[PDB]
Paper text:
[name] is regulated by a CK1-dependent phosphoswitch, where kinase activity at two antagonistic sites functionally interact to control [name] stability. We discovered a conformational switch in the activation loop of CK1 that regulates its activity on two regulatory regions in [name] that control its stability and circadian timing in mammals. We show that anion binding regulates the conformation of this switch to reshape the substrate binding cleft and thereby control substrate selectivity.
Because anion binding at Site two is incompatible with the activation loop in its ‘loop up’ conformation, prior crystallographic conditions have likely disfavored this alternate conformation. To determine if we could independently capture the two states of the activation loop switch in the native kinase, we optimized sulfate-free crystallographic conditions and solved a structure of anion-free CK1δ.
Residue numbers in the entry: 2 to 292
């Protein structure tokens, strides 16, 4: 059988992320199913080792997947990770593409804390999207994980907390649908941009779709610019109309952060936490997919 690490049976391809493909694998020893990321070694700028080092720096964090093994075999760099449960996009589809307010708020609280944690380790994620959040397994089925550090970048020095300089003409990184407005404008990303993207993700869960989704386009350049210009032309107060004002406050707060500002994560969490209590929700972690 085809094995990597002389321990991991390789199975079918199950997705493609930053700079590499993801495969199902089986810990042929432990007997557990795993996820296996492969990067073709035939490149002048390999990334998987860099990503692995970011994960390993993160593993003191709640909701960061465990790395099981890192190595090079034949034509591929290999990173084996703990296999988690479905992505938030998967669960969104299981729930026919609408989440209740309570689920969105329960998710929002944990997703802000994952991003805060990454920032506390001097990195920005730069690919905040529903597919990059996965629920845990078993007694960790209530826990939201964040994955994929292939687009991550250090935003400050560990010692001085000197922020990376302000720069323009930086290329777009992750998905267009959730990119911050500044990212469309080619501005270097910082902490504010991870959080603004989360704001779009939350409104996506509330609405079923964002207003810059499904814009008719013949070529694929004209589909991106219609995303960019609909996102730039749709005020937050229009985007969040008919939803609790916290979501508009969240997005306005994130859009108004200065490039090098430290976000007040606690205030953002309390915004949603206080709304959670006003709606009379309880913390029983019964998400839409548990019903």
């Amino acid at each position: 059988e085809l094995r990597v690490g002389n321990r991991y049976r390789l199975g079918r391809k199950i997705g493609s992320g930053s700079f590499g493909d993801i495969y199902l694998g089986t810990d042929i020893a432990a007997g557990e199913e795993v996820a296996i990321k492969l990067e073709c070694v035939k490149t002048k700028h390999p990334q998987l080792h860099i990503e692995s080092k970011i994960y390993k720096m993160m593993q003191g964090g709640v909701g960061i997947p465990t790395i099981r093994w890192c190595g090079a075999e034949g034509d591929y760099n290999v990173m084996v990770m703990e296999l988690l449960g479905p992505s938030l996009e998967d669960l969104f589809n299981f729930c026919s593409r609408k989440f209740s307010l309570k689920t969105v708020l329960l998710l929002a609280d944990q997703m802000i804390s994952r991003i805060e944690y990454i920032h506390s380790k001097n990195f920005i994620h730069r690919d905040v999207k529903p597919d990059n959040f996965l629920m845990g397994l078993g007694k960790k089925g209530n826990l939201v994980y964040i994955i994929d550090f292939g687009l991550a970048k250090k935003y400050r020095d560990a010692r001085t907390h000197q922020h990376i300089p302000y720069r323009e003409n930086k290329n777009l990184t992750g998905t267009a649908r959730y990119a911050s407005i500044n990212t469309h404008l080619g501005i270097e990303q910082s902490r504010r941009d991870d959080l603004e993207s989360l704001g779009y993700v939350l409104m996506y869960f509330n609405l079923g779709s964002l207003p810059w989704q499904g814009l008719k386009a013949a070529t694929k350049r004209q589909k991106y610019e219609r995303i960019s210009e609909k996102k730039m032309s749709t005020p937050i107060e229009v985007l969040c109309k008919g939803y609790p004002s916290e979501f508009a406050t969240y997005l306005n707060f994130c859009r108004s952060l200065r490039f090098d500002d430290k976000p007040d994560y606690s205030y953002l969490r309390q915004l949603f936490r206080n709304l959670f209590h006003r709606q009379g929700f309880s913390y029983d972690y019964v998400f839409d997919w548990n019903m």
